[PDB]
Design a protein around this nucleic acid. Structure first.
Length: 51
DNA sequence: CACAAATCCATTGACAAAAGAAGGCTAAAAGGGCATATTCCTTTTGAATTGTCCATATAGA
């Protein structure tokens, strides 16, 4: 939801794409940045979890 | 019992190692930005309290 608020603060309908198509990127980005940042007890940075 | 010499404690001085810093670097860590469409999760025993009827006492009709 926090990512969703991020998206709604930046949804652009002039381009004319349906909302869900645009909000999905932000919601997946938020959930994944979350899981990387706060799922380990000994946190490891984002780039390292991507590796 | 005084005078002559070897043996101690102190500064000069320089010299090398060592550490505190500083800059220059580079690995790394953290942001930010993504636009065909995504729409509601997977064993008993006992005591004490709480919510449920029962006795009953009283107040109107």
């Amino acid at each position: 939801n926090i990512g969703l608020m991020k998206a709604v603060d930046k949804f652009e309908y002039r381009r004319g794409y349906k909302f869900s198509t645009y909000a999905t990127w932000w919601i997946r980005q938020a959930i994944t940045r979350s899981i990387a940042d706060q799922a380990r007890t000994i946190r490891i940075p984002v780039h390292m979890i991507e590796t």
